[PDB]
Amino acid sequence: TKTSVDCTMYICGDSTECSNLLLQYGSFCTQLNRALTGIAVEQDKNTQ
Amino acid sequence: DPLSETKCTLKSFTVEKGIYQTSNFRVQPTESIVRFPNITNLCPFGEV
Amino acid sequence: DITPCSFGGVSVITPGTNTSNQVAVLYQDVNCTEVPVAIHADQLTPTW
Ligand SMILES: *[C@@H]1O[C@H](CO)[C@@H](O)[C@H](O)[C@H]1NC(C)=O
Ligand SMILES: *[C@@H]1O[C@H](CO)[C@@H](O)[C@H](O)[C@H]1NC(C)=O
Ligand SMILES: *[C@@H]1O[C@H](CO)[C@@H](O)[C@H](O)[C@H]1NC(C)=O
């Protein structure tokens, strides 16, 4: 199964103030997105 | 516009053919609602 | 009952910048009638 994760919703959610200082941790979510995108693309290459 | 958001994510001024995942979207709230009990009185805590 | 406001990821379909600048926008897991009714400006304009 191919899954995607929204970092902002999972960590903070509907708290607006939480999201603001979450950016101070850097580009952590960007790495997570790229890793999951790589997994999802490979799943279609397997079936091919 | 959507094209420019792709450039910023890719950190480049040119975009190769394909499909890219840029951001997430959320439905903004309509307004605010406060529901509180309807009893109304004065609390006798000043007597303490 | 409580149901969270609709959300999801946003993806942009584009050919090469050399070929053209036209793009297409895909709202992942969003029913087309549930897209916010943006007349002029009412969302955060994520990939308008
Ligand atoms: C509060 O709501 C109840 C309904 O459960 C009603 O009987 C009562 O009259 C209300 N009182 C006020 C002050 O609104
Ligand atoms: C208690 O008395 C003082 C004056 O001595 C008054 O300012 C204060 O409001 C009183 N507290 C009450 C009525 O809860
Ligand atoms: C999408 O549009 C509306 C929203 O509920 C509904 O009437 C329709 O059946 C929906 N269709 C699908 C496939 O979600």
User: Does any CB of chain A come closer than 8 Å to the CB of residue C36?
Assistant: no
The phi and psi torsions of A41 (rounded to 5 degrees) equal -70, -40
How far, in Å, is the centroid of ligand 3 from the Cα of B3?
29
Residue pair A12/A43 in contact by the 8 Å Cβ criterion: no
Tokens of B41: 């009185």
- Nearest atom within ligand 3 for CA of residue C33: 2
What resolution in angstrom units was achieved for this structure?
2.7
Sheet holding C24-27, edge to edge: B18-26, C7-14, C24-27
How many C-beta atoms lie closer than 10 Å to residue B10's C-beta?
A: 13
| Gap between the terminal Cα atoms of chain A | 15
Instruction: Kindly identify the ligand whose nearest atom is closest to the C-alpha of C34.
Output: 3
* B45: closest CA of chain A, how far (Å): 34
* C21: closest CA of chain A, how far (Å): 24
Separation between Cα atoms, residue C33 and residue A46, nearest integer Å:
34
| Strand intervals (E) in B1-48 | 18-26
C-alpha distances out from residue A3 to A32, A48, C20, C26, Å: 12, 19, 31, 17
Q: How was this structure determined?
A: cryo-EM
